[PDB]
Design a protein around this ligand. Structure first.
Ligand SMILES: OC[C@H]1O[C@H](O[C@H]2[C@H](O)[C@@H](O)[C@H](OCCCCCCC3CCCCC3)O[C@@H]2CO)[C@H](O)[C@@H](O)[C@@H]1O
Ligand SMILES: *C(=O)N1C[C@H](NOS(=O)(=O)O)CC[C@H]1C(N)=O
Length: 265
């Protein structure tokens, strides 16, 4: 491969769309590679990690329990709800809802959880409380994926998302058990985790959440590292490209290949 920044540029040229990326040391927060890291991109389903951060903060404060069963109705459901469509009868716990949202990208689960944290405005307020003044949620599933050109709604920046993920996973804003739970939900992603592992060299750790939206919007938030350790946060967003889902996936994989090849930096 070319160096990471060279590959990122190449990806952007080949996609005819915009790429945004941060590679950040998880322990120290140092930024190692950055490309358009202060530009706005739709979060899409990647927002569900921050959502469940806000849920966990409520559990730590005694204002929520992961065991609390939420009974919901069919009229509540939106598109892509593979897990929540199974539990109309008996409901799902708050914790099961987070697992469904993060590990199966269940959109209705995400909306149920958004209710519990005060909606998009409430999640945004949580973001401001942990010192993220950039990321914003404005809408519910599935309208938050619309990705209208130049629309700041439901966006983050690579730099802000990476910093926020580090805060949630490592800063002790969340309790020890909560940090461990949030990490484990990302380890357990069924949507892209196993696919990523199938192309990773032996010895490389992955935990992740992916997303997709309109106008080619695609993204991943991840923890990655050699020696079976989560060494770095990697955030990649794509927007405004007419490329196929397959070519967007391949281009993200190519950036990952370059990071691996030139890891020592
Ligand atoms: O010398 C480093 C390694 O080089 C190759 O590994 C290849 C691998 O065979 C290929 O499948 C992958 O594709 C990239 C797969 C990327 C998947 C992770 C992508 C995510 C993770 C973080 C968020 C953004 C993207 O590249 C690496 C590096 O060249 C060799 O196969 C391997 O034996 C060797 O250990
Ligand atoms: C999140 O971006 N959404 C939920 C679902 N799966 O996302 S993923 O496969 O990219 O992880 C479908 C895409 C999407 C959506 N449009 O709501």
């Amino acid at each position: 491969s070319p160096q990471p920044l060279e590959q990122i540029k190449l990806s952007e040229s080949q996609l005819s769309g915009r790429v945004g990326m941060i590679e950040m040391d998880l322990a120290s927060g140092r930024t190692l590679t950055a490309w358009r890291a202060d530009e706005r991109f739709p979060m899409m389903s990647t927002f569900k990690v921050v959502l469940c951060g806000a849920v966990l903060a409520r559990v730590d404060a005694g204002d929520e329990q992961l065991e609390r069963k939420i009974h919901y109705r069919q009229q509540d459901l939106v598109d892509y709800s593979p897990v929540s469509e199974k539990h109309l009868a008996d409901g799902m716990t708050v914790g099961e809802l987070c697992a469904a949202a993060i590990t199966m990208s269940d959109n209705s689960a995400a909306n149920l959880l958004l209710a519990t944290v005060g909606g998009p405005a409430g999640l945004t307020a949580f973001l401001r409380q942990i010192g993220d003044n950039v990321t914003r949620l404005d809408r519910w599933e599935t309208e938050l994926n619309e990705a209208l050109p130049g629309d700041a709604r439901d966006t983050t920046t690579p730099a802000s998302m990476a910093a926020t993920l580090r805060k949630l996973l490592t800063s002790q804003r969340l309790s020890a058990r909560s940090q461990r739970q949030l990490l484990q939900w990302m380890v357990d992603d069924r949507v892209a985790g196993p696919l990523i592992r199938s192309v990773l060299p032996a010895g490389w750790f992955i935990a992740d959440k992916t997303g997709a939206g309109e106008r080619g919007a695609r993204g991943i938030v991840a923890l990655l590292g050699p020696n079976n350790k989560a060494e770095r946060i990697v955030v990649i967003y794509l927007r405004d490209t007419p490329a196929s889902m397959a070519e967007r996936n391949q281009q993200i994989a190519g950036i990952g290949a370059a990071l691996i090849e030139h890891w020592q930096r």
